């Protein structure tokens, strides 16, 4: 009889995670993203409207302007963005 939760399939990325289209939401320090509808806490210009075709819906973790890897503005006032808390799909290779 089982006693260990059921597995949970990790998510991550390909290549600098521009593909990137999962659920993750939270940074490489805990926080969680910022809409990126949302201009609160922070203003800044990767939008829907801007980058069409990125996936740029709810909070979850993305890179659409092609840096190192998904990323996300965070809720906090004090913290503007970070790297989300992904690893790369070939680091279990």
């Known amino acids: 009889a089982p006693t260990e939760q059921r597995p949970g399939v ?3 990325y390909h290549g600098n995670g521009q593909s990137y289209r999962g659920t993750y939401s939270t940074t490489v320090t805990g926080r969680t993203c ?3 509808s949302s201009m609160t806490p922070h203003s800044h210009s990767r939008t829907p409207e801007y980058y069409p075709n990125a996936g740029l819906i709810m ?3 993305r890179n659409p302007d092609a840096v190192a890897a998904p990323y996300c503005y ?5 913290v503007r963005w970070e790297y989300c808390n992904l690893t790369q ?3 279990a290779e």
């Open 59 to 61: 909070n979850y973790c």
């Open 89 to 91: 799909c070939s680091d």
């Open 34 to 36: 910022q809409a990126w």
């Open 10 to 12: 990790q998510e991550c």
């Open 74 to 78: 965070t809720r906090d006032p004090g």
